[PDB]
Amino acid sequence: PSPIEEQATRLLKEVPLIDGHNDFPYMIRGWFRNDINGQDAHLYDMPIGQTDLQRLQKGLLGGQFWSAFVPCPKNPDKEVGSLEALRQTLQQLDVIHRLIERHPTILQFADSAASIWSSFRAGRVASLIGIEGLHQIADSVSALRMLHRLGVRYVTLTHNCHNAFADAATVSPELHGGLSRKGERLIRELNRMGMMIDLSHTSHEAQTQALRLSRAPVIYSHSSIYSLRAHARNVTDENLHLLHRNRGVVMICFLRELLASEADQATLAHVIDHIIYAGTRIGYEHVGIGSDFDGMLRGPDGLHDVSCYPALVAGLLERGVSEEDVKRVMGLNVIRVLEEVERVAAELQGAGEECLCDELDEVWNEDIKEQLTRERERVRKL
Amino acid sequence: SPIEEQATRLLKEVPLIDGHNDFPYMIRGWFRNDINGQDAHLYDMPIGQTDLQRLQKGLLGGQFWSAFVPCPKNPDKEVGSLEALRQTLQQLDVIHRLIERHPTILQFADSAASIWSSFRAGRVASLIGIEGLHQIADSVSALRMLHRLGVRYVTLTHNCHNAFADAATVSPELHGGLSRKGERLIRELNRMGMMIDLSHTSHEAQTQALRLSRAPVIYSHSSIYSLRAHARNVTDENLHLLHRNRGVVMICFLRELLASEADQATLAHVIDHIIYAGTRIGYEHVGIGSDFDGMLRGPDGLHDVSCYPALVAGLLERGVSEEDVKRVMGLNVIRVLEEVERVAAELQGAGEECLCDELDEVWNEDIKEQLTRERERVRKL
Ligand SMILES: [Fe+3]
Ligand SMILES: [Fe+3]
Ligand SMILES: [Fe+3]
Ligand SMILES: [Fe+3]
């Protein structure tokens, strides 16, 4: 082992490398249909995908935001499709929690900066949860708050579907031209409840608007740099600057199509170029790692699966990024953002800000209400 | 009065835990779950049998707050069932917000220990039940997430049949008790530590569930068939099977379940029903399950949540011992919840397999082949 490899191992022991996005729970849905009973051998050594419990240990990962992604609604009936996504979301959250609870020596649930650290002190992979698109809440802010209560700590505003709140990057034409009025109001509620905003998959204009409106720092859980590779899913220099002002973190993606114009030419070196570009221009306190492992068939050369994180840490150190800055990129930055999201929420909840409520149908007509008020006054007269 | 001072002392010593109150649905009806700036009204409600001042006044120790939503009414049954799941999350949301915005009065509880600490702190222990398996949209995954959101009992039906069990008030019978899915769900409910509630279910569904369950169950709001014949009241057969199950029948204040003429129902009738059950299956298997806010008008002397001291005094006046009154008030339902937790921990300790939803295949064989081909390429590196 070289001095740089031993340096990288020491860093991975000192601070948690917290990855922004991994779709292993969706692979469990694809391969096992969320039935993991008697499948331990396969969960430790998977016949498919970039994640399993042995390789997770091997790469020395400190924490993970596990994705509770479900696809954009396909159904011709938009009501069924939207509501179906909500039920599927609960299935994915259910399998994530069961995965964590059945493998407590490896995985430990975390929903805060303090719970990340205690998990890391115990030698566990801090296991957090994100949902990937506001299509997953079926237009219900109530449902969103219940997802927060189930352990969800970030919400990607869109996937590759426009929704009632925001525009996806990969869909043309634009629906809202950024955020809708409902989207703008939801940003306030996300800040109030302490839900981290994730701007990956959203349009450049939706990012700009959210970055101006948010009272808490946001993340890109898995996006790369537009100036190195022009793509609808990568972050422009304008939005990198607005991220700096927001105090947020861009978690650099391993998607080959986001790193190079020819996908088969993408490499570990390209991921490092993107980290260094962002770190140099907006500071290493605003850059993270957001693999998107299991959101792709094949990774870059040298970042093929979750065992490869030591090569990334070593590669950053080899380019002259300081230990303190590498530690920031590994996980301290995303911990800070989560910490600030909590603090903003506690501040707004302490001042007693009104929560956003769903628009409900009336269930009682005026005759029922009159009967109720008449009954109440009968009781008052007793 | 000596008996009223006795009643007050008992209410201070042990928590009176009521089995069922639909105040959250009244909040949905009246405020549409928008309680911002509505404290004055939540303390002094212009409608209904529950508000925060009267809740204090009656000295209630704990409450299972109902997250009820109506049976699906949509002709498109897929939309209707999924709609009920979304509404359930709305009701769980308003219950949690109600508790969180009034912490001097209400404290969330999900266990025997959290009930006691809430009661020690002078709070109404605030638990949650859902009223009908229509609320889970045929998803056992959803049910486990409702448990994680704080739900601690599930009424198997409301006033509609579902895929798991038959409701009492709907004829003809669909499953003739429990379905095959229903039988399998009982095992999962026991495994996860969800208390089974048999109110609203058919007589035969009760009998089958009472034989199958490995944990004690409740009736969160049902009365006695032999005193008043009704599809919603518990037969002597099922009272005996409840005894064997070690469960608790929480006596209902619904006028229609206490007397043949609803306007004749009284506090005395509720006490007759408690004493009937307590005499025949023991006072350790009887509780109080008002169903306040599941009705327009209560019985004479039990018009709202302020009236619990009159019920406690009335039981003592009829010769029910302090120890037995304390059991009926709340110790029995605390025991059931305790035993439900213990059965769950025991089954989870033995590593029993959880019930999984039947999912659609999402990858065709071409995608699966590409994935295994990719995995083997990685193994060769
Ligand atoms: Fe993803
Ligand atoms: Fe993605
Ligand atoms: Fe009810
Ligand atoms: Fe009811």
Side-chain angles (χ1 to χ4, degrees):
Chain A
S2 51
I4 213 88
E5 286 174 13
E6 293 188 320
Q7 186 175 24
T9 307
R10 183 169 47 73
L11 266 41
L12 286 153
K13 264 54 162 62
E14 281 179 19
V15 305
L17 201 164
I18 297 160
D19 186 83
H21 199 87
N22 186 310
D23 289 294
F24 184 41
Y26 201 74
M27 304 304 268
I28 291 162
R29 198 207 178 84
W31 193 252
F32 299 113
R33 294 183 287 170
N34 298 342
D35 189 345
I36 60 161
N37 292 316
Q39 300 293 348
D40 273 9
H42 296 283
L43 291 168
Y44 276 93
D45 184 12
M46 285 283 285
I48 57 128
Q50 300 164 316
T51 313
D52 59 36
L53 302 180
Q54 189 275 145
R55 288 183 283 168
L56 194 68
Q57 289 172 94
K58 194 172 191 167
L60 305 174
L61 182 72
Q64 184 66 67
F65 287 87
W66 299 109
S67 177
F69 166 79
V70 304
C72 302
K74 170 161 173 160
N75 203 301
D77 193 343
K78 262 58 70 65
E79 261 284 305
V80 173
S82 189
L83 289 164
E84 182 58 43
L86 178 62
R87 185 165 63 180
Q88 290 182 160
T89 298
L90 295 181
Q91 292 169 344
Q92 295 309 106
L93 294 169
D94 177 57
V95 81
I96 290 160
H97 281 299
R98 286 188 290 112
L99 182 69
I100 291 159
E101 287 178 48
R102 264 51 150 204
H103 307 88
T105 62
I106 308 309
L107 302 173
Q108 183 167 299
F109 175 72
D111 59 13
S112 65
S115 57
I116 287 164
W117 278 112
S118 55
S119 171
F120 187 68
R121 301 314 180 181
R124 320 299 192 210
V125 178
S127 294
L128 306 104
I129 310 177
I131 60 154
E132 198 173 0
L134 285 165
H135 70 273
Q136 297 197 238
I137 64 161
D139 259 68
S140 179
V141 182
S142 292
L144 217 204
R145 281 190 293 271
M146 296 303 90
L147 300 194
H148 188 271
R149 190 167 196 93
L150 293 175
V152 176
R153 287 289 175 283
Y154 78 66
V155 177
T156 320
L157 303 187
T158 68
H159 190 241
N160 297 336
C161 14
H162 294 316
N163 52 53
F165 308 96
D167 288 341
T170 55
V171 186
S172 58
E174 296 177 324
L175 211 191
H176 310 295
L179 306 175
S180 72
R181 184 198 249 82
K182 286 181 177 185
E184 291 169 10
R185 185 64 192 75
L186 190 66
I187 293 285
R188 293 179 57 75
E189 175 56 26
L190 291 166
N191 294 164
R192 193 205 61 75
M193 84 170 81
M195 185 66 87
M196 195 159 40
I197 294 159
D198 173 18
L199 299 181
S200 289
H201 285 276
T202 68
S203 66
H204 305 297
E205 185 56 31
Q207 295 164 43
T208 298
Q209 290 173 22
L211 288 164
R212 291 182 194 286
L213 257 15
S214 192
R215 292 173 294 176
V218 311
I219 62 170
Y220 293 85
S221 74
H222 57 299
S223 298
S224 296
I225 310 312
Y226 193 97
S227 293
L228 298 179
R229 197 291 201 263
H231 209 278
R233 277 278 286 99
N234 280 351
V235 190
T236 59
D237 285 343
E238 171 60 13
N239 287 318
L240 287 171
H241 174 63
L242 295 175
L243 189 67
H244 186 284
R245 294 171 59 75
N246 167 261
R247 309 168 53 77
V249 176
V250 59
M251 308 183 84
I252 300 301
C253 195
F254 306 167
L255 282 171
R256 296 164 115 194
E257 292 77 22
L258 308 189
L259 300 171
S261 51
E262 301 298 297
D264 54 19
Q265 296 279 282
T267 60
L268 170 55
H270 292 115
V271 170
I272 294 160
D273 295 340
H274 284 67
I275 291 170
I276 291 167
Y277 180 99
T280 299
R281 284 156 184 78
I282 63 162
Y284 283 98
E285 79 279 17
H286 305 280
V287 191
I289 297 168
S291 65
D292 195 26
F293 275 136
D294 289 333
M296 70 182 100
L297 182 55
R298 182 164 169 174
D301 290 350
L303 290 168
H304 44 87
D305 63 24
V306 298
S307 76
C308 297
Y309 288 111
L312 179 51
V313 174
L316 288 162
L317 295 161
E318 192 172 13
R319 297 278 200 91
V321 184
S322 69
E323 284 198 358
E324 229 59 42
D325 286 332
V326 171
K327 288 181 198 180
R328 282 185 187 99
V329 171
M330 284 165 65
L332 274 32
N333 296 338
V334 69
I335 294 165
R336 192 193 73 247
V337 172
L338 190 60
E339 235 155 36
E340 291 184 29
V341 164
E342 290 161 32
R343 182 156 65 248
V344 168
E347 180 172 17
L348 298 174
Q349 289 167 23
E353 189 188 296
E354 290 183 322
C355 72
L356 182 57
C357 294
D358 288 336
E359 289 266 274
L360 309 186
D361 296 326
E362 295 282 3
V363 295
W364 301 328
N365 60 36
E366 290 294 307
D367 178 66
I368 295 292
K369 293 189 192 196
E370 283 170 30
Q371 285 182 60
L372 288 163
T373 54
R374 283 207 308 283
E375 171 57 23
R376 186 73 187 85
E377 298 309 296
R378 189 191 68 77
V379 173
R380 285 195 202 284
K381 290 167 185 185
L382 300 172
Chain B
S1 176
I3 219 82
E4 292 183 354
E5 287 183 311
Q6 188 178 23
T8 309
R9 183 169 49 74
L10 265 44
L11 288 153
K12 263 70 213 308
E13 282 179 11
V14 305
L16 202 167
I17 295 157
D18 185 83
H20 199 87
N21 185 308
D22 291 295
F23 183 42
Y25 200 75
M26 305 300 281
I27 291 162
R28 198 207 177 83
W30 192 254
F31 299 112
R32 291 177 288 169
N33 297 342
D34 190 339
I35 60 164
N36 293 313
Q38 300 295 338
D39 277 354
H41 295 113
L42 290 172
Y43 276 95
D44 185 13
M45 283 285 289
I47 59 148
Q49 300 164 316
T50 313
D51 59 37
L52 301 179
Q53 191 276 142
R54 288 183 282 166
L55 193 71
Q56 290 170 91
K57 191 166 201 175
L59 311 174
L60 183 71
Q63 183 67 63
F64 286 89
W65 300 109
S66 180
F68 166 79
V69 304
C71 289
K73 223 75 170 288
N74 199 307
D76 191 347
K77 297 188 177 185
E78 257 286 306
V79 174
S81 200
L82 290 169
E83 178 57 33
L85 176 57
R86 181 164 63 180
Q87 291 179 352
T88 299
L89 297 183
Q90 293 170 344
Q91 294 309 106
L92 295 170
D93 178 56
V94 77
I95 290 159
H96 282 298
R97 288 188 293 112
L98 183 66
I99 292 161
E100 212 146 317
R101 257 61 117 198
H102 307 90
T104 62
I105 309 307
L106 302 174
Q107 186 166 297
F108 175 69
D110 60 14
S111 68
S114 56
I115 287 166
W116 277 113
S117 56
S118 171
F119 187 70
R120 300 316 181 180
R123 321 297 189 207
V124 178
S126 292
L127 305 104
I128 310 179
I130 61 152
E131 197 174 1
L133 285 163
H134 70 275
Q135 297 196 235
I136 63 159
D138 252 78
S139 177
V140 181
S141 296
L143 178 61
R144 280 191 293 270
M145 297 302 90
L146 302 194
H147 189 272
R148 191 163 194 99
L149 293 176
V151 175
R152 288 289 174 282
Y153 77 67
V154 176
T155 321
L156 302 188
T157 65
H158 189 243
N159 290 337
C160 48
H161 303 306
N162 51 54
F164 306 96
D166 289 338
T169 55
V170 185
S171 56
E173 295 183 316
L174 209 193
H175 309 292
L178 303 172
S179 70
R180 194 203 268 96
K181 286 186 170 197
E183 292 170 0
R184 184 66 193 76
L185 192 66
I186 294 289
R187 292 180 59 76
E188 177 55 27
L189 290 163
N190 294 165
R191 193 205 63 75
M192 83 169 81
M194 187 67 86
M195 192 160 40
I196 291 158
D197 174 17
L198 299 182
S199 290
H200 284 272
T201 67
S202 65
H203 302 298
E204 184 57 33
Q206 294 163 51
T207 298
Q208 290 173 22
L210 287 164
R211 288 188 196 286
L212 267 23
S213 187
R214 294 172 293 178
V217 311
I218 62 168
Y219 293 86
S220 74
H221 58 298
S222 295
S223 293
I224 308 309
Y225 193 97
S226 296
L227 297 181
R228 197 290 198 269
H230 207 279
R232 277 277 287 99
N233 282 348
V234 189
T235 60
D236 287 339
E237 173 60 18
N238 285 319
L239 288 171
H240 169 67
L241 294 177
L242 188 66
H243 185 284
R244 295 173 60 75
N245 170 260
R246 308 168 54 78
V248 175
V249 57
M250 307 182 84
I251 300 301
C252 195
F253 306 168
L254 280 171
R255 297 165 117 195
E256 292 78 29
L257 307 186
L258 300 169
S260 57
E261 297 294 292
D263 60 353
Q264 303 294 309
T266 59
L267 171 56
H269 289 112
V270 171
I271 294 160
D272 294 338
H273 283 65
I274 291 168
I275 291 165
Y276 180 98
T279 300
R280 284 158 183 78
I281 65 165
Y283 283 97
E284 80 276 23
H285 304 286
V286 191
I288 297 166
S290 64
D291 198 19
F292 277 135
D293 288 334
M295 67 183 97
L296 183 56
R297 181 162 171 178
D300 294 354
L302 288 169
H303 46 264
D304 62 24
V305 298
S306 77
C307 300
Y308 287 111
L311 180 51
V312 175
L315 287 162
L316 294 161
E317 190 163 355
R318 294 274 207 94
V320 184
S321 72
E322 281 197 11
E323 220 62 31
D324 286 328
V325 173
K326 289 176 187 183
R327 284 187 185 92
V328 171
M329 283 165 63
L331 274 34
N332 295 338
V333 69
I334 293 164
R335 189 193 73 244
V336 171
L337 190 62
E338 237 157 39
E339 291 184 27
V340 164
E341 291 161 31
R342 180 154 60 247
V343 169
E346 181 172 17
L347 296 174
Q348 288 167 25
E352 191 191 285
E353 294 184 327
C354 68
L355 182 57
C356 293
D357 289 330
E358 302 268 35
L359 305 187
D360 291 324
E361 292 284 356
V362 63
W363 300 328
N364 62 40
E365 299 302 313
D366 172 53
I367 296 296
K368 293 193 190 192
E369 283 180 347
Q370 287 178 67
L371 288 163
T372 55
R373 231 149 59 213
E374 171 55 25
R375 185 73 186 87
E376 213 61 22
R377 188 194 67 77
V378 172
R379 286 190 201 282
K380 290 170 176 188
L381 301 173

